[PDB]
Symmetry: D3
Subunit: 303 residues, 6 copies
């Protein structure tokens, strides 16, 4: 039967069938959107990312046969659980709904994909992984986001991992790659190091990418958290707070690919994408491809 | 329970359930998108209209309780049959697929709603109504679109009604409102008048709206065709070929409301919306509402 | 001496001197910004409105000598009290800071001008007018915004006046002009009416403007709340939720001028402007002028 | 044979042949661009107007057969003399080249069309009409532009007609229609009235259009100067300094149409268009049409 | 004498004199535009590329004297034959129109430059080179475009070279550089390899550029086909289907320079530029320079 | 107490207090804007750079505590002297206005930061340093800008350093880094080499950055002139005339940091930024950070 072109059809992630978080379904991969962006401190727009990512994903429908002739994502079923129904304001309630939906989706698929949304969504998302022993997080980001309080709130996008670690004793380690910028929260940096978290500045990646990959976890349960601002603004300009000299698509993917080949990937979130800030549309196209390519790697090497 | 905000959830028309054109379903209203825009002669973009209209319709989910406290479209069911699976190029094939999908959708609902796409789609769309006795078309448009041949083709968006008439002996009358501009195809104008069509220049709408409403069909089977460029460019700038001094949203709606109150409406199409040409987004927001409001009027006078 | 062009100098409202809300100063008019937009339910951007309005106001620096040769606002002093320092999230805290800043600014000027920010800011702003006997509000808006709860919160931009009335027993009446749209909260409309509020649909403005002006308050203490979406989207497209067929600039100005001529104006807010949604920049340019022209009218008939 | 679509071919005004200002040629209508915008005091962009107007004119290639079957501009020949070769800065030099080019094109056609450029170009342009006895100017503008000095210069866009009158004793009268705004130069207004110029505020057009048309010249030599900001910003947003409540396209055309039919038109300029400020592209499309329609009126009443 | 600034004058490629494809002229270089984009399967806009490239080329008017003092293209004459007059739809007719214009232009210049247009134009363009013995094509592209059928058509932008080869036995080899992405048509890859085509993935360019250059043809008749999406989207975002990690301008230019210095260049096309997808305008500016710089390289080694 | 988010408050550079150039104040660093862009020869917009840079700097408010926990700019005071009041046109008067304001600011701070404005402003800015012995200029630029005459004027942005050298014999040397492009003014290049200026093409930076840094001055009075187009267009697209393959943010900064470490920095200007040409906003965000980071470097090596 004929297939739709990218501009045709209802935009669901990877053109997957639509389902309800608490519905009677099962799939290898399931996507869930979290259109929440009221926690960021600069330019809004990430609330539109889930829809933009779904639309851009229509250019990356699995499976994929590479130039080398190998096919990946063969026999991997997909489902789109829609978006968490968010209230207006009421961050605490939003968090609870996000965690609940994440729990349900996680219990019906092998690898859940969460589409943000500003980075604060990673906190309630991680709460749905409390039963994962020695849970590790591999985070691509220009920022650490391990802050306690910022602008009189505990729920900003600058505090998701700090909030997660205090709510999840099983979250034993975080590896953050791509840090750069003129300013860092000293209390957050100290608190992270105090917990043994691995901080890898973008300088480390540029100097020796092989060494960075060597610093990644091995044989661990890993949750991926990809903040699009970890990538260079020239590559992905569509984000609220860009920082120059970031990861190339290739570098970020190489890192994800490496971790995926040596660990049990329990989930992934893609946050801070701001479609409205990139009229060329390349930001959502490249990031949608990033998610799909990461899944390729995950299923091409899973235990 | 909780309801999605406009920016949340998968965008299906009016948040209706997704169905297959020839699937086992039935509803009062069914939407079908036709993301086809390679027939226009100027600025492309209408291929993205169905999707933009679905997204915009999330701000107009039925039913509607107005300022007067009365509700419209209460109990009226909706379905979104997706988009016609179009080929690349191959206009003839695209036409056949459009007619077939339109037929199947028509037989499963009371009022089908077609989202273009450039105006050329009205031709294959109308072929699905070849069985309607004394079929009348009420067309809102700045242009006549009754041209025989243009730029060496019979399938341009300037010929849909000419192609429709020579193919449908049951299409006995066309009422076109909003015509304006410096250039008009003399052959098309003569041909239209010769077939007994009613041509109402925008000047006449401005001079006396009440008079124009009296020129509309009465007690006939009517198919609505709304070219967004019939509306003033200041109101709806998102379109390929705008013409100054057009219909206000109110005037166009008054015409549709009047016609819907005195005839049996068999279908409606909304064509030529170009989301990419209006960065303010008002064009799609207003046209999604126009479709929903027209439906309110149609179901208010159902016999 | 030489004067800056609109593109030169630091942007302060009406190019007025910068002051602190609780500083030692006095002026006839004082502007205060509230860059808060996390309570709206659709498209963000109003957090940038205060800044855009300041930049745009440089095109409207007082006093003004009209075509007739007369001068308005001669000798009327201005001050820009900057913006309320808002936290991230924490709506209740934001509300408290807004009310405190408003009180301070009110106590140091004759007419305070508040630049939003989504419409939810009108609630904390009004709390600063608790000592105004029989306070009346003249509201220009496409929406009523008198809803109790919406999307599980009491602080959305759809509830500012409901929250205001319950917090301020002195707020005895609201006149809302410009209402239109397919959907209204029946409870909100009925409650407003049951409280004696005056609802004037845009249809009435169109049908008989004189009749509308006749419904405006007389000899009352009036606070002006101008929601830019009250204006037609063709005129002011830069707003989150546009509704077709709205107020022209002239009509809205006639309404404000009429009220300013017969009442004691205690303050004015300009909300819901979304600069990011109008790349032509006409929305902020026209709205900044509206504020300045409104002040011209106010000071022309002050007692 | 086959004709180019609007997006095809080299963009020359009305798709007329290209020629040199001082070349060997003759034509009824000749276009000359003046990409000069360093004299305006706000937002740049008019330097690109000539090009945008040329591109937009491809939508309006003469002749035109209206809905009445009657054809206009039949037999009228067109030519495009390109643009004046302007230096960087050096306004005095730019003016001299503008006048010289204007003189050369004037002597080679019946009706020259000048594409600005900011309004200051009207001055050196008018200097080319020194030999026209009792020259009258019909100016559509939101501003008077009869200022002596502004921001320490005599050459701004606010002084073209002031400069033109003091350099051309044959320029006996000016009728300005569409004036509006909060500020007017009292010295400029007084100076204009002193010379007996006619000032028609936009309110007069709104209150009584017939009274306006009755004030236009009859049987005079007329030069048309159309500042696009005379039109409502909702209709033509692409301009540096928009002012609310202006001329609708139809109103502006009615004025130009009346003057065109009752006088000997010796020239016309279209200034202040800023394509970069209207991403919908409707500003250039509508203004290119205005020029062509004005020409239809001019040659439709030739003696 | 005085010369136009980039925003001045009629935009012709390299500001060259305008000529007709079948006119009496002869130049070393001749540009021909093909504003055709209905064959691509995603985002349209390439029909505007020829015009955008012409305008952008005004920034690179030959000849060019570098920092070293050496001048290039000195004495090399240019001509702009306008654009192929295309019909609406009717791809077959369009193909014929294109081949004919290409034949005419090829016979009047030494090196013809074709401006696309989506990549499907390369096929009818190549048909004009049937008499070139052992024709080789050096293709810069992220995609292979050697597909047989896609979305039910043989004429999409994914099939130009497949169509060219089956119609031109003299087209004995293709070298494609820059390939990348998750998906490749296995049937197309196998068909290209069976014909002995050289496939050079972007990976090899990044791994060893020297080696890639050593793989380029030598002493052959070469036709250059530059798909802008061969370049990294960060550099050239203006294109329908971008793929991350592509050629820098420098790398792509180094490839073209090497091939131009060791072969007899018979022509070149520049396709898939989408000006509407890059509001910064760098895409057209850099791609116009690419054509001019490639020409510098070409004529520096002409025998 | 609480601090403003980036979108909050009046936008002054580094959120520093506003002062008058000749007022009674003193600060370590002082900013002065020069909103002048009528001298460039292509795309306008730089007149808005000073405002965009100030707004963007709110994301880089000092002091800065880095990842290492060390703090820079601690105790270093800032001030914003506003903008030079410029006339319309009248370049010579503007030049004088600029030089005087610059001198006044210089006498009240240690390191002045000048925000352009097209590159021509560097000339009048440098005249303010006529009292500095053996003044050296380190210029980051894609162009040499040492041209005598261009487009019949001596004041274009292509002549600033040429104008400065002939007016300031104390300016004994200029080191330009990042030069690239197809065209260079042989006259300008010769005049520069004659005076012994050091010319470093971008190729040199790419080939051996360490070698470039060894060519920078030591123990000299240095003025930094940073033209944003010296950076790669992919990184900083917001500029009038971009050139492919330029400096990465890191490279440009490495050069600035090296010169600041062993030289007495007397000032710095940031020119040619065009906010209107980069809708993603990254251009102003990155260049504002560049200015701030450069100051960190400067005050880290004060004698
Ligand atoms: Mn983050
Ligand atoms: Mn981040
Ligand atoms: Mn139409
Ligand atoms: Mn139509
Ligand atoms: Mn409101
Ligand atoms: Mn509202
Ligand atoms: Mn004017
Ligand atoms: Mn004007
Ligand atoms: Mn390609
Ligand atoms: Mn290709
Ligand atoms: Mn420069
Ligand atoms: Mn430069």
């Amino acid at each position: 039967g004929p297939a739709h072109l990218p501009y045709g059809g209802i935009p669901t992630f990877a053109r997957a069938p639509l389902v309800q978080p608490d519905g009677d379904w099962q799939a290898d991969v399931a996507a869930l959107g979290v259109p929440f962006d009221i926690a960021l401190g600069f330019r809004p727009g990430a609330r539109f990312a889930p829809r933009a990512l779904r639309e851009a994903s229509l250019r990356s429908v699995p499976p994929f046969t590479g130039l080398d002739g190998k096919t990946r994502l063969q026999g991997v079923t997909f489902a789109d659980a829609g978006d968490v129904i968010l209230p207006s304001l009421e961050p605490q309630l939003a968090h609870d709904r996000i965690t609940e939906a994440a729990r349900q989706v996680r219990g019906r698929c092998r690898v859940p994909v969460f589409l943000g949304g500003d980075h604060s969504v990673s906190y309630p998302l991680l709460r749905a992984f409390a039963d994962v022993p020695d849970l590790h997080v591999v985070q691509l980001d220009a920022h650490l986001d391990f802050t306690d309080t910022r602008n009189d709130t505990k729920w900003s996008n600058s505090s998701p991992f700090r909030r997660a670690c205090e709510a999840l004793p099983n979250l034993v380690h975080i590896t953050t790659v791509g840090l750069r910028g003129l300013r860092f929260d000293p209390e957050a940096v100290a608190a992270a190091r105090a917990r043994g978290h691995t901080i890898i500045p973008m300088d480390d990646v540029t100097a020796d990418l092989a060494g960075v990959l060597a610093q990644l976890p091995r044989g661990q349960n890993v949750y991926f958290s990809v903040d699009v601002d970890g990538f260079d603004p020239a590559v992905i300009p569509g984000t609220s707070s860009p920082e120059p000299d970031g990861l190339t698509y290739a570098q970020g993917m190489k890192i994800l690919a490496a971790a995926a080949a040596n660990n049990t990937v329990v989930g992934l979130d893609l946050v801070e994408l701001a479609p409205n800030l990139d009229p060329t549309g390349r930001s959502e196209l490249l990031m949608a491809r990033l998610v799909m390519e990461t899944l390729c790697e995950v299923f091409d090497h899973v235990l």
